[PDB]
Amino acid sequence: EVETFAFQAEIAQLMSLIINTFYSNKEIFLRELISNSSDALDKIRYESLTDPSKLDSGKELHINLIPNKQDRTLTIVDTGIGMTKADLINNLGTIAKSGTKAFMEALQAGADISMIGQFGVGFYSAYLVAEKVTVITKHNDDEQYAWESSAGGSFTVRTDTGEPMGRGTKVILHLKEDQTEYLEERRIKEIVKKHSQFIGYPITLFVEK
Ligand SMILES: NC(=S)Nc1ccc(F)c(Cl)c1
Structure with a gap:
């Protein structure tokens, strides 16, 4: 049973941009x-104190990067606090409503797309390289859920019947045909070392067979 929701106007506007x-x-x-992923791990870590x-x-707090060249997908797995159904449908879109608006004003005052994280809406930069994004998430207080969107102004939410994750969030990026360089081992390593060297959780890059 799949429910289909429309993005908020500002969020759909950002995704198209x-x-x-x-x-x-x-x-x-x-x-x-x-x-x-690092923020979500900080949250479950602080609550566990x-x-x-x-x-x-799940005791382990880590981040796994899993490229798959045959499916042309890149998966980022964290064992963070996860997301509830209300987060996937309401709360996260409400918070991002204002960050999207601010980020759009800045983009006309000279700012560029790389500053998107300063407005709390960095997640949507996934659509720079992905034609479709799937999010499998499990929060301690809710069931396992599957969020999905190919932009176009709508997204879907359903209970996930697949493999249970225990706790955390799985972001599956179905890459565009011309963005397969982010499936190569040495390219991912260069990006992680450049931008995420100081993340305070272990990041493991799964190599394919
Ligand atoms: N950073 C933000 S607004 N993230 C986000 C918002 C809605 C979602 F459904 C998911 Cl999965 C992530």
Whole structure:
């Protein structure tokens, strides 16, 4: 049972700008997604200080990057706090409503796309390299959910029937045909070292077989 929702007007406007604007420095998408994973890990880590049972769904706090050349997908897995259904449908879109508006004003005052993280809406930079984004997420207080969008102004949410993750968020980037360089091992390593060297959680790059 799949529910279809319309993006908020400002968010849909940002996604169209991110997809249609000529901008060559696309690698920053990884910095933003990794930074988002780091925030989610900070959150579950801080909650576990006063409530250790919040880690019963998984003690390890890490970030995995999983390129897949046959499916042309790049997956970023974190064991962070995860997202509830209300987050996927309401709360995150409400918070991003104002950050998108501010980011758009700045883009006309001289700012460029690489500053998107300063407005809390870095997640949508995924559409620099992806034609479709799938998010599998599990929060301690909710069921496992699957969020998906190919832009166009709508997204879908459904309960995920696949493999249980215990706790965290899986971001699956279905890459555009011309962005397969982000599936190469030495390219991902160069980007992580350049932009995410100081992330305070272990980042593991799965090599393919
Ligand atoms: N940084 C932001 S606004 N992230 C975000 C918003 C809505 C979503 F459904 C997902 Cl998966 C992520």
